[PDB]
């Protein structure tokens, strides 16, 4: 019997945050049923590194941090340790030797309609390359020079957010591949997510 925390519910919803307001859904004390997502799943690019996708239920980790994302298909491969590109460098980054799964599935349907969606922005042109797992929520006119402008854009002072300009008739690599980065956490705290 056991139970089932709403992993499969947060996985599917009309609206997954953005690339920078990416959700931080902690999970504990639940038998997260991964069989649905690996044993029998239609979820492309189910590339999980840190532990083999098979027999993943056998593994217990201390805090499952399901992530929510909408990123262009080309940038899907940018969700990896370091890699390159606007993802994982100016955005949610995954630390080296990170343990977890990356489930990226095409989402041309399910809330991806004509015209660049108001939500599902970029997050680029920040001061540094960011650190792994740190949320970047605050939005401020990004400084690209010495003079600090006083809150209105122009040249430099770039707005650090950019709308994903996709239509439901884009190519193959441009359709938003809704991806979740299931961030395992094997630390010195008691393991909570176990079970078949």
């Amino acid at each position: 019997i056991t139970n089932l925390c709403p992993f499969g519910e947060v996985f599917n919803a009309t609206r997954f945050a953005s690339v920078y307001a990416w959700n931080r859904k902690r999970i504990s004390n639940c038998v997260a049923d991964y069989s649905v997502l690996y044993n029998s799943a239609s979820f492309s690019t189910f590339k999980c590194y840190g532990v083999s996708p098979t027999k993943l239920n056998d593994l217990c980790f201390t805090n499952v941090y399901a992530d929510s994302f909408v990123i262009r298909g080309d940038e899907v491969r940018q969700i990896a340790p370091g890699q390159t590109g606007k993802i994982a460098d100016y955005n949610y980054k995954l630390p080296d030797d990170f343990t977890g799964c990356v489930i990226a599935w095409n989402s041309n349907n399910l809330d991806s309609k004509v015209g660049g969606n108001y939500n599902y922005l970029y997050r680029l042109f920040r001061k540094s390359n960011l650190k792994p797992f740190e949320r970047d929520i605050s939005t401020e006119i990004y400084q690209a020079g010495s003079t600090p402008c006083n809150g209105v854009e122009g040249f430099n002072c770039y707005f650090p957010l950019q709308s994903y300009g996709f239509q439901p008739t884009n190519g193959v690599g441009y359709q938003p591949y809704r991806v979740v980065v299931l961030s395992f956490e094997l630390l010195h705290a008691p393991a909570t997510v176990c079970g078949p």
């Epitope: 606007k86 400084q143 770039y158």
Partner: antibody, heavy 123, light 108 residues
Framework: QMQLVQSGPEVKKPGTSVKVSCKAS????????VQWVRQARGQRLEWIGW????????DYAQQFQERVTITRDMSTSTAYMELSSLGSEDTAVYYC????????????????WGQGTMVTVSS | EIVLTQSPGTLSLSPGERATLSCRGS???????LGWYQQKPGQAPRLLIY???SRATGIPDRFSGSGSGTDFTLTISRLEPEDFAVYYC?????????FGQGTKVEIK
């Protein structure tokens, strides 16, 4: 010295489309915006349009409404510019500019300038 | 549509005496988002100054911006002969940016 090269001269039927290519190399052409100004023969230059490669923003002068589109290309690190229904008087060299700069937070001024792209609208 | 009237173009300046070029803002604009880049006679231009902050990159520091608000000046305490070129004061503050009035400077 950072190379900002562009396509050679183009001869185009007045009232048609043009595609001015400006490739930026030697520096990160992702954190740098791009700026286009037109210089004819003898009169000082003015906007064509300017874009931010990363920020997805594009502008242009009030005299170039719905007739200038400036498109980026990160894959080849180039800035493309299209003048639709360009007037017969648009015969001029079409420049491209950007800050010669590297890093997330990088230089402010417009150090590097393109070699220019002579554009002629001839019968 | 910002208009930057300047010191009259074709103003005579030669090495051995102080040279000065100036363009005045239509309305006093932020100084650090200006900049005067010169176009050589038959080449692309290159940045020299912006808000009087930096030096003249690739040029001896005789070049130097100055002024506040509308009236910005580039002083050349001892002019040099290679600078026969047309300067103009870039304006990259508010969205509209003005780039042409003909602030030519000749040498000898």
């Amino acid at each position: 010295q950072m190379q900002l090269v562009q396509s050679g001269p183009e001869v185009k039927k007045p009232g048609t489309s043009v595609k001015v290519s400006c490739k930026a190399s030697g520096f990160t052409f992702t954190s740098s915006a791009v700026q286009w100004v037109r210089q004819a023969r003898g009169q000082r230059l003015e906007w064509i349009g300017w874009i931010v490669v990363g920020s997805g923003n594009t502008d242009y002068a009030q005299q170039f409404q719905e007739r200038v589109t400036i498109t980026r290309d990160m894959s080849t690190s180039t800035a493309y510019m299209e003048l639709s229904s360009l007037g017969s008087e648009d015969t001029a060299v079409y420049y491209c500019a950007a800050p010669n700069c590297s890093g997330g937070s990088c230089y402010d001024g417009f150090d590097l300038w393109g070699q220019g792209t002579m554009v002629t609208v001839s019968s | 549509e910002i208009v930057l009237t300047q010191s009259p173009g074709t103003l005579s300046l030669s090495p051995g005496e102080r040279a000065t070029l100036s363009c005045r803002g239509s309305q006093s604009v932020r100084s650090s988002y200006l900049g005067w880049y010169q176009q050589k006679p038959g080449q692309a231009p290159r940045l020299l100054i912006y808000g009087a902050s930096s030096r003249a990159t690739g040029i001896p520091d005789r070049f130097s911006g100055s002024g506040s608000g509308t009236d910005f000046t580039l002083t050349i305490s001892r002019l040099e002969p290679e600078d026969f070129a047309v300067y103009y004061c870039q304006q990259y503050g508010s969205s509209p940016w003005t780039f042409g009035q003909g602030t030519k400077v000749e040498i000898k």
